[PDB]
Paper text:
Wall teichoic acids (WTAs) are glycopolymers decorating the surface of Gram-positive bacteria and potential targets for antibody-mediated treatments against Staphylococcus aureus, including methicillin-resistant (MRSA) strains. Through a combination of glycan microarray, synthetic chemistry, crystallography, NMR, and computational studies, we unraveled the molecular and structural details of fully defined synthetic WTA fragments recognized by previously described monoclonal antibodies (mAbs 4461 and 4497). By using an integrated approach that combines microarray, synthetic chemistry, X-ray crystallography, NMR spectroscopy, and computational studies, we showed that S. aureus WTA glycoforms bind the mAbs 4461 and 4497 in a cavity formed between the CDRs of the heavy and light chains. The GlcNAc moiety is a prime recognition element, being inserted in the antibody binding pocket, and the RboP residue to which the GlcNAc is appended and both phosphates interacted with the antibody surface participating in the binding.
Author numbering:
A (entry chain LLL): 1 to 219
B (entry chain HHH): 1 to 132, 136 to 217
Write the structure that this text describes.
Amino acid sequence: DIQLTQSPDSLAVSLGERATINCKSSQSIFRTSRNKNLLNWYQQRPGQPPRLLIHWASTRKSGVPDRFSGSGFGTDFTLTITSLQAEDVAIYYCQQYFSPPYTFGQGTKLEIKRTVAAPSVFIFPPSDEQLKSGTASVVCLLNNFYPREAKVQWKVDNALQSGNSQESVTEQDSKDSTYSLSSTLTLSKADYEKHKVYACEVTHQGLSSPVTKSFNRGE
Amino acid sequence: EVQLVESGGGLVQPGGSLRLSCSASGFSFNSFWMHWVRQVPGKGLVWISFTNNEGTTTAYADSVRGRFIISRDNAKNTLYLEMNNLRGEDTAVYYCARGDGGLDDWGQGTLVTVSSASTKGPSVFPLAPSSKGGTAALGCLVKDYFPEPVTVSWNSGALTSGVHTFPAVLQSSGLYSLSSVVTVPSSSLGTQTYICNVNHKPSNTKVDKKVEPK
């Protein structure tokens, strides 16, 4: 089996700048009889099927912008993206089409670098309908921030919580290059009803100091 | 055009069988190689199988050889993948692709979940907008379901701007949870109704939840 190794695994490039993604094959994928290197490049945008950019190492598929170009010979290949656009956020894959199995590289995740953007922070108490079920979920939303690094701490009557929350983060937005994040604090109804003050404290580079959003149970 | 539509994915017991279908339109099906590729959620593309134009040459990834069978019905413009003796490692989104210069016209993919766990539909709770702007946030918490996936739309697909549907997280119970949120003009809250449309097809659970300010 032919192994493709991409480098780097992760790449952060500013809007308008140039990305360089390498693909190394464990053996030559130059088909002498065709005078072609049988290397394909794909873009897989968040939540989308893969899109073919390039085949035969350097031939662009019709309708792919000329900002995307493929180069290399034999075992060493490069995808270059010039004038990076917000919609280029994706994982990029190489694939050999020389001999089955038609193996893919492991992918290169491309992050768009943009200006720092503070999160908008929202807190949601548990619904009356859920409380009837014996569980309380408290949600804290961090909306449209950059960069990715964010600290979310839960406090209940000022006691710092650990082990009873989970976070989820969206992929970078294809238009504004931001992330959003949810933190969900899960308590029994009994524990929820024993405390008054529910607080989500957010630390992010875009905030001059941590932001707290809070509510008092039953208001 | 060219359209490939995968179907036949779903929850299946380990050791069981599934047949995936890839329905092709808008081109001469029998003039092109066809591929299956899979993707474990949040992981890379893994080539699985191909067939030449007539189905006289096929090949398979090492991990599926002797368990999976690719075939095509040129008369019905359909590609198939018969999957036998399924394992946890086979859980993935399965894509079909047309062979041209590269793999092209990828379908939307079909999720195959190989598990002995029971189907369970979600509970849907509102994330109500509060008095605190210009911008308001509201949402739906879709809690305690198995397997993936759930779909969430807002106002039957009329509301798309500012929607974030979070990746599902696996809880200590082994059930999934996710939230879907949307930011809207706070000026809309008086008059605009907001309904999240949740569909968990594996359990036949469809819920339309009105999210009302408190």
